[PDB]
Design a protein around this nucleic acid. Structure first.
Lengths: 114, 123, 125, 209, 56
RNA sequence: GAUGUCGGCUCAUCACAUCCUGGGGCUGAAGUAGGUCCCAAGGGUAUGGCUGUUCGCCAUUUAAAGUGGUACGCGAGCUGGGUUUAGAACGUCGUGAGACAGUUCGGUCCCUAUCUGCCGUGGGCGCUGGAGAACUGAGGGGGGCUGCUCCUAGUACGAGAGGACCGGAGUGGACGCAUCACUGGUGUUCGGGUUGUCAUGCCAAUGGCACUGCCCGGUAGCUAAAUGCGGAAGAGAUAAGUGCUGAAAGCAUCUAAGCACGAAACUUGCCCCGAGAUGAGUUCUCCCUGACCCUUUAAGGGUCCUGAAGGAACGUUGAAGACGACGACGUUGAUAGGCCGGGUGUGUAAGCGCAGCGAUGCGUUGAGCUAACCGGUACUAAUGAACCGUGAGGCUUAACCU
RNA sequence: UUCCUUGUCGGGUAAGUUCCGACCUGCACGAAUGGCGUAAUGAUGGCCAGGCUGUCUCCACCCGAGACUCAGUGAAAUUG
RNA sequence: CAGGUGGUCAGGUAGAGAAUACCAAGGCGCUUGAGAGAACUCGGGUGAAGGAACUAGGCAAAAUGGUGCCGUAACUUCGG
RNA sequence: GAGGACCGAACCGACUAAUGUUGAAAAAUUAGCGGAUGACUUGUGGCUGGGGGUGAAAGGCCAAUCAAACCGGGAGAUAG
């Protein structure tokens, strides 16, 4: 409705960069440990994107210390400080859920090369 | 989201490789244990010369789950497997001296500061 | 529950519904008026009227896409050669449901459904 | 304190600058117009009757139209009463806005829950499903026993059985007021409130703490 | 499960007190042909709201 | 001329001789922790291993893992392991047929609900002219659990070890209600990939069938594992208990007169239903202000005229729904469909061009398509009517006006 | 085949009245109404492990056939 | 009347095949329909995390599944 | 190129589960299951007769019938 979308558009970020599934991004989040607040980076592959305006989200997957980690970010949350695309991947699908079953050389993604 | 009969990997160097949750502690009829919850475990597989052996009944704290944790802004942090850290049965202190793989900040408490300080990466 | 769901089941499986409405849409554009039950007639609107909207832009892509929905070249020809131009200026609502009596065999509520511009000049062809 | 009658616009979220997502329910609260004031002398209890929204003149009946004309207000989509606490005074025709909740911290929202229709005992009363296998014969989601043998010889009143579920009055208590937007007739409460989108809600200050 | 006593003709009539049919309230009259018809239905000769809609 | 028998499952309900939580007295009660008794039934009161098991033992929890009644509650609700048919075998007994609460392997669990009951949901009439709303609340139901940490305070207490009452704050478990913003599930009505085959003349492109052919994603809706909220505080009267004053009985005495405290029980407070509450309540608003005849002359009958408020019906329908019901709307119209725009999902259509021997690749191109979503739009369908409902509403008395 | 009996000890399990190994105290084994072994075989009995899973924790949604409403036809057991 | 009933005939594509899938020749849509899209029952599909905790018992379901090649234990009556 | 050999359709059988249980059916259906060159299966015809037959033996089978078939008769058996 006109009422709710008006409340949502005034909370949305205006500078979120464009990225596709398959690109490796570096997300910087705010980590509060009391009186301090630093930026912790989280670099990995974008395997899913949910476009819902204010409720948009994307999930990044990375292999950290031998353990696979997926993190779903709320792209318009003030916790997410910045988003930067490192390299652009070339995939055919919109959800790269098959990457969960692959590793090493099997989880490689061709560069989009645009 | 760990319940009884769930097999977990071990995230420390105490010697165990596979443990099975036999009780979710901290409440009657309690069903699941998330990251940061204490569970009673039995050791199903250990290395030949570790600090623990197959068959012992100890306590453990869950540090990684496939179900994941939820952050106050609605984010989720999921892992590829369930992992725990073995604790002394009565002192609730970590048995091993090293921690493998990342952990989350749900463990950020004076009770598990030993684990946070030893973790290779805190998420 | 059924909240906000659309589309009638009509006591058929999915493949039967799709085949039936494909045939019924072909019969509607061939005769420009048919007689069927009132529930079938109301659901037919959501099938045939999108085909007429599609037929307003003649192109090999639209023709093939229309052929995929009807599987009858005689039907596709009439859509793009007759019904397209006939409804070029009308913005939706190409059909008209006129309720009539009840079927003698099972007391089903019957209804006529016809194209709106089925006038006295339709007798030319 | 008296309450207000609003409409459930929907649900969204409010991001706090410190990185917390608050699930909120947007309640459109237009001006509530007082249509009748009841007192101890004439009615035996103190209360106000309010209306809200608008209504097409062709849909209001003569009995209803004469009631609104008596008050001198435009016909709304309904009438609701609010018991007056000692000290509250209102005059007929007076309009009440959402800024009444400017300093209210928690509210109770009353609405009509969504209707589930005829619901089984599993859905309506959280009954346990019997075995799906191991010989069970046509008795997977049935309620099982409904009483004891001959000694009572009957089913007790209030037994939990299948029946109509939802579509009834439900009150959620002690919801935090996130934001009061007076100029836009909006009221944002934390959490979820009964009813579907577009249903009428009654918002009162929390009777408890 | 089956009855233990034969229900009476009185009980049978009480159950059928809701089985009565409801006749159609009133028929509409076409403005052109003056025929009677069910409201919102075409007439027996193909008229509806004063228009020959089907030529049969 | 049949009352299906153990245990389990599901679903319970009551008792109190109380397992936990609450209130107390005594203690061989320092504290912590107990012992015992009194009051108290509001709520709560494990998961597994073994066994047909009830039980029990064991493992590990928990504030606690209460004891009983209810056809050893519950097979026209489920199960069929056990027990208790016919087969077979062992040990044993018998010359033998056979037998053994000895053992062993195998071994058909029917019933479409008339009545009572119960859960829901309507129709009728009533409530005294009719109608539309908003209420009052007699009465009924729901709900009532509790851990841990911190502060008070390492204080009181104690040789030390240890370690509080009372009071406050936070955070959990179990349970309940609501909801779909988030995280997800589903999503045979959306998009794509692909195997076999058949067809559309053929190529190309599509469609059918193969569990939706097999799969990968996924909108709305529904939904839990998701996230909001709940249990109270307070008040009244009390239980056990503790008292004040105080005689009978110069004293003493909580009691006899009188007065004060006192618990999750009781009555309220919170939520829901609720005037068929026939004791049928209240408030507001709206509508109807014609004749005439007959008769046994009355709460009488009839004819003509009149038909209101409103209702129902019909139609378009709904996050309402088995059907009724309930809600919205019916051209003075956004009720549904379509249409337009957007969003979302899928992931770069087809055609053409180019490269390649070719499979294929690249460009046009984030293309094409897109359900239930959002915002618009009278294009289609919601019709002029007709129908029901009337015409000032009994008697008595009392206070008021005439 | 053992009543006592869930004998005792060992193995397996966090926990094993079942299972496997042993002991001999064989209530009441025993040598063609055969004794003890035995590869292969078994829709045979018991037990364990991997895999697998809505069997379950704890159910959710969906697709169909009924149930429900309308029209036509039209039973039955039972019954002072 | 979803049962039973001997023999003969044996197309195409894929396939080891008379299996199976889709078709030819040929023959049919099974003698009540129409709506609706509740509980519940039946037959199916999918399922977060867990993975036998279910249960008398892994009952049922899920899973495995083809061809070629490599490789293959105790034990054995020398064949497995 | 042997085999009461192996896998597996027809065919024969009937281990499990669900459904059905006034059924579609007085024993079936659905999904799995066993045998499938043999102690195999099947057609047509024949033979064995009731204290008798036949029985790879269950008191099984002998026309939906079996610890002594069916039909008629003794017969209105007898019934503390």
């Amino acid at each position: 409705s006109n009422i709710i979308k008006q409340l949502e558009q005034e909370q949305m970020k205006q500078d979120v960069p464009s990225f596709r599934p398959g690109d490796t991004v570096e997300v910087k989040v705010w980590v509060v440990e009391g009186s301090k607040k630093r930026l912790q980076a989280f670099e990995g592959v974008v395997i899913a994107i949910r476009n819902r305006g204010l409720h948009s989200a994307f999930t990044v997957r990375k292999i950290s210390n031998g353990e696979g980690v997926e993190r779903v970010f709320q792209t318009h949350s003030p916790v997410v400080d910045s988003i930067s695309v490192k390299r652009r991947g070339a995939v055919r699908k919109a959800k790269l859920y098959y990457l969960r079953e692959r590793t090493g050389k099997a989880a490689r993604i061709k560069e989009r090369l645009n | 989201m760990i319940q009884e009969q769930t097999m977990l990997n071990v995230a420390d160097n105490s010697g165990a490789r596979r443990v099975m949750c036999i009780k979710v502690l901290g409440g009657s009829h309690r069903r699941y244990a998330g990251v940061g919850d204490i569970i009673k475990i039995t050791i199903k597989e250990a290395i030949p010369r570790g600090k623990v052996k197959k068959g012992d009944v100890l306590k453990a704290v869950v540090v990684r789950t496939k179900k994941g944790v939820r952050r106050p802004d609605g984010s989720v942090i999921r892992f590829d497997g369930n992992a725990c850290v073995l604790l002394n049965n009565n002192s609730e202190q970590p048995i091993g001296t090293r921690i493998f793989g990342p952990v989350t900040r749900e463990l950020r408490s004076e009770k598990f500061m030993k684990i946070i300080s030893l973790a290779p990466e805190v998420l | 529950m059924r909240h906000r769901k659309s589309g009638r089941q009509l006591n058929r499986n999915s493949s039967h519904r799709q085949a039936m409405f494909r045939n019924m849409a072909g019969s509607l554009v061939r005769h420009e008026i048919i007689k069927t039950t009132l529930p079938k007639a109301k659901e037919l609107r959501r099938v045939v009227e999108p085909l007429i909207t599609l037929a307003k832009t003649d192109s090999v892509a639209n023709r093939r896409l229309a052929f995929a929905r009807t599987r009858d070249n005689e039907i596709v020809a009439k859509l793009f050669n007759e019904l397209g131009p006939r409804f070029a200026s009308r913005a939706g609502g190409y059909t008209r449901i006129l309720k009539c009596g009840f079927r003698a065999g099972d007391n089903a509520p019957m209804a006529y459904i016809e194209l709106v511009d089925r006038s006295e000049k339709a007798e030319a062809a | 304190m008296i309450g207000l009658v609003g409409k459930k616009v929907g649900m969204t979220r409010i991001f706090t600058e410190d990185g917390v997502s608050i699930p909120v329910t947007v309640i459109e609260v237009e001006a509530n117009r007082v249509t009748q004031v009841k007192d101890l002398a004439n009615d035996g209890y103190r209360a106000i009757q309010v209306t809200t929204g608008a209504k097409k003149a062709n849909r209001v009946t003569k009995p209803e139209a004469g009631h609104f004309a008596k008050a001198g207000v435009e016909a709304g989509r309904g009438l609701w009463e609010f018991r007056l606490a000692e000290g509250e005074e209102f005059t007929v025709g007076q309009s009440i806005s959402v800024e009444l909740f400017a300093d209210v911290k928690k509210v109770d929202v009353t609405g009509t829950s969504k209707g589930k229709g005829f619901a089984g005992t599993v859905k309506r009363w959280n009954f346990r499903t019997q075995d799906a296998t191991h010989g069970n014969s046509l008795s997977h989601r049935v309620p099982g026993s409904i009483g004891q043998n001959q000694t009572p010889g009957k089913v007790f009143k209030g037994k939990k059985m299948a029946g109509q579920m939802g579509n009834e009055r439900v009150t959620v208590q002690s919801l935090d007021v996130v934001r009061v937007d007076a100029e836009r007739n909006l009221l944002l409460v934390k959490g979820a409130v009964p009813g579907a989108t577009g249903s009428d809600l009654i918002v009162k200050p929390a009777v408890k703490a | 499960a089956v009855q233990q006593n034969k229900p009476t003709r009185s009980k049978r009539g009480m159950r059928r007190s809701h089985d009565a049919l409801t006749a159609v309230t009133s028929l509409s009259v076409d403005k052109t042909s003056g025929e009677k018809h069910l409201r919102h239905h075409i007439t027996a000769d193909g008229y509806y709201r004063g228009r020959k809609v089907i030529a049969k």
